[PDB]
Amino acid sequence: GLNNLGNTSYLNSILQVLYFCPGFKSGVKHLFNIISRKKYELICSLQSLIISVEQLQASFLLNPLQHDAQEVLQCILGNIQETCQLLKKGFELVEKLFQGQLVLRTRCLECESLTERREDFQDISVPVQEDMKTLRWAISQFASVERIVGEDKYFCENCHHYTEAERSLLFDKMPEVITIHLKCFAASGLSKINTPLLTPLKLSLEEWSTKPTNDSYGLFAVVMHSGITISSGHYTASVKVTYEGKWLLFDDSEVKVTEEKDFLNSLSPSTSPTSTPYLLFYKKL
Amino acid sequence: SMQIFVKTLTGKTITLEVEPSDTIENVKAKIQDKEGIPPDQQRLIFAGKQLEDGRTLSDYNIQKESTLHLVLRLRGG
Numbered sequence A: 001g002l003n004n005l006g007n008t009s010y011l012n013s014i015l016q017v018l019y020f021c022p023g024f025k026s027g028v029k030h031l032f033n034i035i036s037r038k039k040y041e042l043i044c045s046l047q048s049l050i051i052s053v054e055q056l057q058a059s060f061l062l063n064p065l066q067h068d069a070q071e072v073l074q075c076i077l078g079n080i081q082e083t084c085q086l087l088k089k090g091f092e093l094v095e096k097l098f099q100g101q102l103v104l105r106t107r108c109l110e111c112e113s114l115t116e117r118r119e120d121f122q123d124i125s126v127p128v129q130e131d132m133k134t135l136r137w138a139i140s141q142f143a144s145v146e147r148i149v150g151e152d153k154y155f156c157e158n159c160h161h162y163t164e165a166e167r168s169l170l171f172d173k174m175p176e177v178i179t180i181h182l183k184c185f186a187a188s189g190l191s192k193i194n195t196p197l198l199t200p201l202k203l204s205l206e207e208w209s210t211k212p213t214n215d216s217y218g219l220f221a222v223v224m225h226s227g228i229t230i231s232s233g234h235y236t237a238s239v240k241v242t243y244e245g246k247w248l249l250f251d252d253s254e255v256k257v258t259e260e261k262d263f264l265n266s267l268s269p270s271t272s273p274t275s276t277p278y279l280l281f282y283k284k285l
Numbered sequence B: 001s002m003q004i005f006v007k008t009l010t011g012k013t014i015t016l017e018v019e020p021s022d023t024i025e026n027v028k029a030k031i032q033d034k035e036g037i038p039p040d041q042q043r044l045i046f047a048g049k050q051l052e053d054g055r056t057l058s059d060y061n062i063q064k065e066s067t068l069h070l071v072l073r074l075r076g077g
């Protein structure tokens, strides 16, 4: 009868990733208790879903339109955040789990003056190809010094002129969960890039941090998209259990337990996978 | 009036001359003028929030040297 789960595979993948985020369902339970003795429908349906999935997972262990997944994640997280602010006027669940802060610097190449902008972020949108690559290459393309020249000259208020500039991004405040949004799509007209990056199990962003940090990250969830186009396809999710150390493979109605080695080998771009990674999730160690 | 940055699909940064009264549709039209992506396929993220059509940059407090992030939709089902 679960031949209808596939219709919401974007939402299913996002819910399977959020159910295994550390501290997410604890925070949702806390907000649900608050809203209960307040007497919001998103929090209550989230609680109902988490209890249903707890029932199903307890049974498993003992008695064996089409939409974008990142956009659905964004909508759910924004709704939870708004609920938290309203209940505030414990209430910093999204801020502590998924929200970091960037320091964006611009250096004019004429006067060599530095201007800074501070912006929040919930995920990191990195490219997958240039116009075999690793995730380090993509985060460098995101955050290393880029020179903006030509038609994209910077207007410097100090020179009162158009100048070439160097932009660089740095990670200041860090969330507990790092979401890598992979831009696996290109424009000439629009097509999907099926070649994935060489994804690591361990990630360090100290190369692009404002301060020297020893905090490393570990890959625990991957959302993949299957299809030759960007307008249609199927979303799957691979989550790591922290069975602890195994990767659960969610495909519509059937779940597969997997070794970390087999999962990492399936992620390899040398095997040419049909499931293209789209969202990578890294939790602080 | 003010200049903002947009990180494109390849990570390359482009610039835009905009007004605080400009709408997200106008910004998307300028991004199409520079990149060749129709405005209905563009998603713009600023400070973690997706810029909704019909709103203005002033509604989001987008200032000079603010950076938008341009992604597409990867639809699944």
Ligand SMILES: Cc1cnc(-c2ccccc2C(C)C)nc1NCc1ccc(-n2ccnn2)cc1
Pocket (backbone or CB within 6 Å): A011, A012, A013, A015, A016, A017, A019, A053, A056, A057, A060, A241, A243, A248, A250, A252, A253, A254, A255
């Ligand atoms: C078939 C299925 C598909 N989706 C989900 C699911 C999971 C989390 C959040 C949301 C969903 C759905 C409702 C979108 N759950 C499923 N089945 C239950 C289940 C859960 C966990 C395990 N498991 C094994 C070892 N550790 N946990 C085994 C079975």
Ligand SMILES: [Zn+2]
Pocket (backbone or CB within 6 Å): A108, A109, A110, A111, A112, A113, A156, A157, A158, A159, A163
């Ligand atoms: Zn200058």
